[PDB]
């Protein structure tokens, strides 16, 4: 019947993205892969790591702004 034709992902920033097979999502975050099995189904692999503990107080009040980490989604300061 109906089968998977792609990987419907959601970025941490609030964005539902459509990846086809062998497609990936280029964003500074936990890398999103979309692959297909030998049966034709699509798998959404999230390449995830551990982000460094962040002091949001050590930012902002100290005169900084909070950015996004490349390679994983977490809080960081300029």
Curated annotation (Swiss-Prot):
It comes from the Eukaryota. This is von Willebrand factor. The chain holds residues 2647 to 2720 of 2813 of the full protein.
């Amino acid at each position: 019947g109906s089968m998977a034709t792609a990987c419907t992902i959601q970025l941490r920033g609030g964005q539902i993205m459509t990846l086809k097979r062998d497609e990936t999502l280029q964003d500074g975050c936990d890398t999103h892969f979309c692959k297909v099995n030998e049966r034709g189904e699509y798998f959404w692999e999230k390449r995830v790591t551990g982000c460094p503990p962040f002091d949001e107080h050590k930012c902002l009040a100290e005169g900084g702004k909070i950015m996004k980490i490349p390679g994983t989604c977490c809080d960081t300061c300029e």
